[PDB]
Amino acid sequence: DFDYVVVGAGNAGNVVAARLTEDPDVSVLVLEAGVSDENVLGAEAPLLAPGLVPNSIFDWNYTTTAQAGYNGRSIAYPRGRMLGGSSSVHYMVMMRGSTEDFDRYAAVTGDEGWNWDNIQQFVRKNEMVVPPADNHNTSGEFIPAVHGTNGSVSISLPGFPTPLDDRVLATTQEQSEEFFFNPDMGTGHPLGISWSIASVGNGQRSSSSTAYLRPAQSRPNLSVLINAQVTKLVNSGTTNGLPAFRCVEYAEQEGAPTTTVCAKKEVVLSAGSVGTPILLQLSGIGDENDLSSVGIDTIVNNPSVGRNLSDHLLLPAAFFVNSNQTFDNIFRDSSEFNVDLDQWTNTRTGPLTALIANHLAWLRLPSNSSIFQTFPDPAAGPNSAHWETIFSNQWFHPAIPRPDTGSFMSVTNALISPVARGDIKLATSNPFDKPLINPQYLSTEFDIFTMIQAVKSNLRFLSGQAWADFVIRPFDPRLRDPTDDAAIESYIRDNANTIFHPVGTASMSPRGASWGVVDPDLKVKGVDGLRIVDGSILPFAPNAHTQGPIYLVGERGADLIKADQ
Ligand SMILES: Cc1cc2nc3c(=O)[nH]c(=O)nc-3n(C[C@H](O)[C@H](O)[C@H](O)COP(=O)(O)OP(=O)(O)OC[C@H]3O[C@@H](n4cnc5c(N)ncnc54)[C@H](O)[C@@H]3O)c2cc1C
């Protein structure tokens, strides 16, 4: 039987599986609940990514509980269910976080092996810069020296231009005090306006399955099983005086018989920030009171399981624009779509290689803001962001379909440094029931205050000379007036959503410590033979879309595992 069992063939899981099997005497079994990622056009052509989830066979079909912060709205909580995990359904944006993110991870765990300097080696293992699809000149769009040249995942600058690009660039000159240009987020200094970098190579998605699993497919010491949902982690004895969890039960679907397998060395949980805590709770690792309320016997009492959930909340906003070059008609007119698809199929170029956004702004509140009377600074540090602003050459709104008429650009914000914390809990002891996902969005004055400020910032940005002949008006009339705080707050509470970056539900913390679920080496506290390598270990929201930091967790996790062999 196998040396390791990896639960979840996801963003991080695939790194662990591929890295461990580099050694021919180490065998790994990967168990993935979902289907194959092969022959999924929507998971290959970059521009088609937003259609893939939430309501589909490639999604877990999770939702949140009703959010009082959102006027009682419950929202979709998409999560990839397939080879590659969420890296097969994500929007491919790549950055690693701020130096302050990783230094805070090191400080909070007492482990300097996290920390900005010591993590850089894994950027180089993880990524290689390849040409953008349109083969444009990337000089001055990034800094080659801070990025990998040889690593597994293909990354590139935007493969298709938009009419937004020159106008965003002009705004960095015209409004340089607020919206200065940033040469590369890979410096660990996120603030300012940078060109998007994305996990796209030869005009198609570079996911954790394409980058790690596929090249490793002919290895006899690696097995990958799809349609295999792990339903229980099995207490398989007592090694080192602690309960051991080296066996798992899995099934194809609800009501199907369960297969048992055991790892000789360790079970690695890579089920992600939703999947990991819920499986733990189903296995009797969690909050005693919550477990017994649903009929589960607690084997390891740890109330941190599924707590300390952070996410980046999302705010969408569309604006009518005077342009015939937005991407909107690709999704309305079959002739245009089919011309673009033929070009993508034959040459791997054209509009289908385009990203959700070619530029991103990372921004702080003024250091003298009224909110700092009542709150300490929740940012990772003085060089980190409070919010993000994303510029898209089309309609983008997770909860409202694209209008039949109109050309649009969208300005999407993410709250990067929330004060709010949430939790993930079991509604029942049945592994095929949906969990209760309660992020507690907009439940603090800080979080709503910052979002009101973000909107005012967006409107300053778009009032610039570069936009004069382009932006017509906001889709929603509550965005007509920058001084109307009541209208702005109403807009936010009715439109806010999620940008799909949950972390923290199995937080790392120092060995033997207060709260947390895992040690700094990612071993589960109070258990032997169980390791967590995914987004759930990160104790704070980073200054980054989460694929980049999660890949670093995956690469270091693999080295941590090899060190105990
Ligand atoms: C719509 C969307 C867009 C996004 N866009 C971006 C972006 O542009 N840039 C960015 O950086 N990030 C983005 N993200 C976030 C990023 O995709 C995730 O944060 C990251 O990929 C998660 O990595 P992970 O390894 O923690 O989990 P995942 O990649 O989600 O992996 C978990 C895997 O485990 C499987 N699994 C779960 N439970 C079980 C079980 N019991 N048994 C067996 N298998 C199981 C799942 O099916 C999945 O394959 C996006 C996310 C979404 C939902």
Ligand SMILES: COc1ccc(C(=O)O)cc1
């Ligand atoms: C509006 O564009 C984006 C870009 C990235 C993401 C993400 O990281 O999920 C969401 C929306």
